[PDB]
Design a protein around this ligand. Structure first.
Ligand SMILES: CC(=O)Nc1ccc(CCSc2nc(N3C[C@@H](C)O[C@@H](C)C3)c3c(c2C#N)CC(C)(C)OC3)cc1
Lengths: 155, 578, 580, 578
């Protein structure tokens, strides 16, 4: 609906915490989405803005919003090694086994970049360690292919 | 103005990182042993374009500088992708300005900008180049190319891919040496000597249409026209230009060194007068700029499309031609071009005023017109639109000195811009000159699946690139003149992510495999315009001193702020601040 | 003479249109943004040659002109056929006429024309070409290459094609970078270090002869000498010279723009003095033309004329000087296949050197009267333009296709202008084309559907035809320590007649041998052996003279009025002597 | 001084004759139509390098000379092997001596010699090379490449060859141009425009390690790391430097012809001062050779000497200066593998920097007496010419005028040198300037056996050259900088003749064939350095007038001796004797 929606998407992207608090106060749609289906929560999760994440969730941001290719804010946080954000999303109800259009899960993405603490947190919250993507691969297969033996321990 | 030399290269269908990492870096690393170089700057963008600008000390002979640059470039040519070498890598003196910009319009609605550009290329440009006093002439557009617009549904139906289309065009649009009957050394007493003439380059859409792709088992023929639409069109479709709303091409004309401006301008106008009787209907020459033109910048948000920008440009044009009808002769609206960047979400309108004499009163002068225009345009939502004419400013480069990479340099630049915003008493309008990261479609080809299926990675990458980016295949002859042949998907099969899975590749066993079988994709952010300064990754920052501060003190602050940035980030002053 | 830069390129086996449409046009489209350029012209010939001449305003710095033309040429280089790039494109800044000719003969008769030409190409030309002030050097002959003369019957008998020959030569005449034993980084403690030497370029006909083409199922061997005659022979066979009727070669030397003639000539003689002591026995330098004491004779036959016919006319001209003018003429160096029009089968030149000033008393024994008499004696030679002159008031006209009309329409328009000009002997004399007429050519259509059905690839078809009938430069070899070329081509007797087309076989994907006749058809047509362009558009150059006591100005004015009546899309310009 | 233009090119893994016959002769034959050229000379070496020196008449403008050379070379580039073109050919107009050496060490000893050299190559060299006045820059070390060190036992186990490795690297370390979503020309109503990002260059050993070579029968995977060790390492390993005994790298800088020595040196220092703040911890610049105060020591061992024996000689030279001359010497910067005559396993150079003049009182402590003492101290080192000097008898070229060949020319040279030795009253130290033939390993591939087995000659020659010589495959991105990828055998499989037989090639039927089945080998002699002069095979000979004789008398005798040489051998005077 909003011209304010578009400004909230930009403020969240560019990290501007005050501006986010203001636009929320003046009624911006917290679940405004850009052309690729990214919400303010997606943007804050990708770009690592923890306080923006928390602020959006308290104002009703949808924790499992999915972009046009099926990816969620938790995919993005996990892939890019944003640990504190991963915990907050999971604390606020993020689907730990959400699969994108390719069957990729946040654990697959964390495992691929070698983000070991994130792998651990996801696993606490009930991540299906044997979930397979469209090619049949698991987090374990990923660890083997990348030659990351520390990760292969944990799985 | 220090003399400057610009290198321009093109990699059709390449993204900014691809251009930077296969072209820009390679040229830069070869820019040694050149005299009098003060600094070098480059940009590599999402239209597949690179410009490297070498700025020389004042008093350097610009011809000597141009040749030394060109020679080093030419020795680096074999290090560049074939596709880049095939587009031509130009090296020109770039500090000289235009003597004139000539518009070529069609007023009776019968020609597209591509039609007009072909006419100009084939019938006007070279006569203008030979005109007394003319140095460089740039065509704003191209001659025609033969456009083969592929359909993936038809290709798959006949078990064909773009690779087969490209192969067939190289085989059947060909011209090669076939020797002679009775040639030397002959059997003595030979009387017959004749050249052998075998295949000749194709000359028409009809001939391209008949290229034979294959014959089916039941004896039916698949012709290129059964899998593609075929038309004369442009080489590139990045820019759309209109003159008072009508399609238009143009020539940008520079003065040869040592020639006289007034005589050269008059000689150009006399040559264009002599051509006029031969023009087709509705073609007209207009002169928007010739030694009171001002500009209106248009910038849409990330990922905005050409059609969205066109709508804004059309409102800008309509404004000037109604609300400034007494002051404005013309609006030359250029969609896709912007000085700060090329791309679909940018444009500029070049506005030509009527003669000063016909614009009495201060309210009819450039300053008042532009302030009124900017105020009317601040209504426009979903675009930034600013009118302006052409030293308190500074020109600062932030530099990656230790291999930090784009994402870290950007965070450093953001720290610097936030800090400079905390000192509004000293610094105003401290901003990036360049573009922000935008969403990109990252597609990962699964090598294991490709190998298990027997699908070659070269077939995959050629299929994707040719369809979605376009490919220059080879040359043809149009009405006696050599021109390029391009293959690309028809627009409707290359618009959105779901179109990816309509493209099939042929495996070694003959089965057709959809892209979805061996690839996966996701959204990510990356740069549409990468900058370098003296061979290192950079981000240009503009700014000015606060009212009642000198640029001297404002620069000094920027240096203090820059001194607190993360480890490995440096800076330099360039341009006016050098 | 305003300064000129010339671009030259070569495409072996190419007809004029193929040269024009794959080389000339691509280069010319970049020839803009060059300072002080007056005009550009080009010829594209059925010798597979192109020459583009760019003419600059008087006083232009020729170094700078050459640099700027080459800059623009580099834009086109990656778009040229590999076959042209590999011949070496040249960019020269020379006078268009020869400063001198250096002739070479063998007074023991123990070297043929071909041997002499190789000796000069291999031991003399390069040094002369590097001498300061030498703008251009023309060899009157050809360097040897290694010639592989294929036999199509033998190739077919072993299920081989020219593609197989070419492949084998690239594989077995190779120079391999093979590394080292014990090279860096080594196992520490390594003492042995040595280069590995693997294949190296072949050096002799004997080695080329034992290239191994295939091993039969029964174990027998097909060597290259089983399908081909192998010998050293010219890169091409188009240029043959004689000095006083004996076998010769030579170098035609042109002066670099602005260079000093006395000095350059002297530097050339000093370079020749270094070479002389190492000549094989019999070999001798002669000096048939030092620029008056000299003059030339041009021989120009119609397009279509064989080497043998041009030779017949050269023999008449040399006969005349050696019989009729034997008291005045010291020497004639005659060249068949090269002339004022450059390279061509229907063209020759004779360089004539006179005896001493002192031994030719009287006006009638001076160069003017000798050349007048010569031209008169040669004026009766049938179907040949032969004249003798040493070294103003004509005009030089360019008819130009300005609308994509094409060669055939441009010819019609030219003939219309020439017939109209003929009706004004009062204002215009000897209005005539500078170029060549169309000649019969053999048009071959490859049937794509048949090729596909049979499984014969277009590349194999094209290589087989081009290599057999045109010759293909394969790679280099080393002849007596010098890098030289290797060419494959049909032996002469298998590429003389139209029915020979059908004796050439191509191998299908299933291994069957398919004759050319199965997937091709042919017919006779006409086309051009020399296509001209002026400022990048198709053109036809017309020369002529103002009639007795009319100004060039009135003559030009009438040509312009006659030109104004030609079909739409045909324009004109003035060039050369008419441009100011 | 007559200005000289130098052309340099390289062919990885080529021997001298290969370089000469595919590169040097091709370039030389195309050096026509160039003004004012006095003479040309070349060396073609077993390091895979060529250097062609074109010397111009006194008073020639060196800019014009360089331009003319560059342009003729550009037109000859298509005639050279692709392997050479892709390395970059350079053309320089510089003095042949060093203006200064920039040394780099790590004072915390935390970076190795190889690390330091990469840092200099990747962060310092290009900005120095662009500094005005800098004619040539030699790195004393090598930039990193991604090194794929192949194991032939593992390749054979998986039925693979270096050809398969190269093919996979090209396919899987690729930078793909993939076009755009919503790209131009677009459909009406399009809302989204975004770049498509597909494959990108690899950036790390880990990524190269996971390149997928094949999928086995049972679906197990063979990764590149399963057949190779993957590491960053030098593009070559030929040049190693030390500063006062510690690991070092640096830049040797030569002044451009006609540039100002003091101005250039100050511009270099100003450029280093921009880099210093971003150095990793411990890195430090030293100044071991600024052109009294300094001198050099040449180390030239006979052809065939190992890196290890050259090092042992340099360690003796360095030790002498740091112990016997420690009161006079501040520093020694020693380079193994580069010398006065450029690159080679058997050559070195030491740049020596003296303490302040004021702290070296006495004639005995000035440069002249020091170099003379050092030369005396080094005159008894075995099988090495070692001398100390600062930057004239005769300079003679013996010339093959008749296609005689290297072996006959060497015989004629030896005849001349024998005759010269019999006149010790007129001529002294008449010696060759180049190198003697050494043993080489001649391997003959048996074409019959290869064809019988179905083994391709291209697979054999690629296998041999890539494993034993190394092959530049393509580029990758190291810490944001484009650099090279090389495949070669790990050291232990390319040390000895029996190792040849552990390399297997795959036949058309899929069988693995060892090299021993289709080859044979022998020892022979050939040249590690072939010389040419004015385009002809040549051998340079130096010498001088015997005491109390003029240079003219000694030259006259040389000419008299040269007139009695075998048929087809000529001569010419060059350099100081021209
Ligand atoms: C396909 C295409 O490029 N079409 C096209 C683009 C531009 C044009 C000309 C627009 S008018 C114009 N263009 C300029 N440019 C400059 C050029 C470097 O870039 C192009 C796109 C347009 C400049 C000026 C005018 C006017 N009036 C004035 C000035 C010299 C001050 O600034 C440059 C015509 C057709």
């Amino acid at each position: 609906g909003s011209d304010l929606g578009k400004k909230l998407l930009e403020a969240a992207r560019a990290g501007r915490d005050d501006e986010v608090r203001i636009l929320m106060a003046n009624g911006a749609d917290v679940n405004a989405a850009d052309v690729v289906g990214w919400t303010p929560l997606h943007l804050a999760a990708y770009w690592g803005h923890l306080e923006i994440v928390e602020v959006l969730l308290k104002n009703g941001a949808d924790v499992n919003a999915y972009d046009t290719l099926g990816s969620t804010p938790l995919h993005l946080a996990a892939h890019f090694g944003h640990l504190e954000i991963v915990e907050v999303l999971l604390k606020n109800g993020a689907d730990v086994n959400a699969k994108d259009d390719n069957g990729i899960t946040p654990l697959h993405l964390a495992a691929n970049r070698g983000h070991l603490e994130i792998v651990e947190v996801l696993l606490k919250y009930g991540a299906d360690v044997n979930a397979q993507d469209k090619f049949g691969k698991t987090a374990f297969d990923i660890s083997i292919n990348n030659g990351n033996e520390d990760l292969a321990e944990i799985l | 103005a220090p003399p400057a030399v610009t290198i321009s290269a093109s990699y059709p269908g390449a993204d900014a990182k691809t251009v930077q990492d296969t072209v820009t870096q390679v040229i830069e690393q070869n820019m040694n042993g050149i005299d009098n170089l003060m600094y070098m700057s480059s940009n590599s963008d999402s239209t597949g374009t690179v410009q490297i600008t070498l700025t020389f000390e004042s008093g350097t002979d610009a011809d000597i500088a141009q040749v030394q640059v060109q020679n080093k470039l030419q020795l680096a040519m074999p290090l560049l992708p074939q596709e880049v070498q095939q587009q031509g890598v130009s090296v020109e003196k770039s500090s000289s300005s235009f003597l004139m910009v000539v518009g070529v319009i069609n007023t009776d609605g019968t020609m597209t900008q591509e039609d007009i550009s072909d006419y100009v290329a084939a019938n006007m440009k070279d006569a203008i180049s030979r005109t007394s006093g003319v140095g460089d002439v740039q065509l704003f557009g191209s001659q025609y190319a033969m456009r083969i617009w592929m359909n993936p549904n038809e290709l798959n139906k006949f078990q064909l891919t773009p690779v087969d289309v490209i192969t067939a065009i190289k085989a059947q649009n060909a011209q090669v040496a076939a020797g002679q009957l009775g040639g030397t050394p002959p059997v003595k007493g030979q009387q017959l000597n004749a050249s052998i003439i075998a295949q000749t380059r194709l000359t028409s859409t009809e001939e391209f249409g008949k290229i034979l792709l294959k014959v089916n088992q039941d004896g039916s023929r698949v012709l290129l026209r059964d899998v593609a639409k075929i038309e004369l069109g442009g080489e590139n479709y990045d820019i759309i230009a209109e003159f008072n709303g009508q399609p238009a091409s143009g020539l940008g004309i520079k003065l040869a060194t040592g020639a006289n401006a007034l005589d050269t301008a008059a000689a150009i106008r006399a040559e264009l007068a002599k051509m006029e009787p031969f023009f087709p209907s509705g073609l007209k020459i207009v002169y928007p700029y010739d030694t009171g033109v001002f500009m209106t910048m248009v910038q849409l948000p990330a990922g905005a499309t050409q059609e969205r920008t066109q709508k804004v440009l059309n409102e800008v044009t309509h404004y000037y031609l109604t609300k400034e009808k007494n002051n404005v002769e013309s609006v030359f609206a250029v969609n896709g071009f912007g000085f700060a960047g090329r791309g679909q979400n940018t444009g500029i309108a070049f506005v030509s005023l009527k003669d000063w004499a016909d614009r009495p009163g201060e309210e009819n002068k450039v300053e008042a017109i532009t302030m009124r225009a900017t105020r009317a345009f601040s209504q426009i939502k979903d675009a930034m639109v600013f009118a302006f004419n052409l030293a308190t400013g500074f020109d600062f480069e932030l530099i990656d000195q230790a291999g930090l990479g784009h994402e870290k340099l950007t965070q450093a630049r953001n720290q610097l811009l936030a800090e400079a915003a905390k000192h509004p008493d000293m610094l105003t309008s401290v901003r990036p000159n360049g573009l922000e990261d935008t969403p990109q479609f990252k597609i990962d080809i699964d090598q294991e699946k490709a190998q298990a299926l027997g699908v070659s990675i070269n077939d995959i990458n050629t299929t994707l690139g040719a369809a979605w980016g376009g490919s220059y295949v080879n040359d043809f002859i149009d009405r006696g003149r050599v021109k390029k042949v391009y293959v690309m998907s028809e627009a409707k099969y290359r618009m959105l992510p779901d179109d990816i899975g309509d493209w099939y590749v042929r495996a070694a066993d003959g089965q057709m495999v959809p892209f979805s079988a061996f690839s996966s994709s996701r959204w990510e952010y990356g740069s549409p315009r990468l900058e370098r300064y003296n061979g290192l990754p950079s981000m240009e920052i503009l700014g000015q001193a606060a009212p009642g501060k000198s640029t001297g003190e404002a620069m000094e602050l920027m240096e203090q702020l820059a001194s607190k940035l993360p480890t490995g980030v440096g800076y330099d002053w360039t341009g006016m601040s050098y």
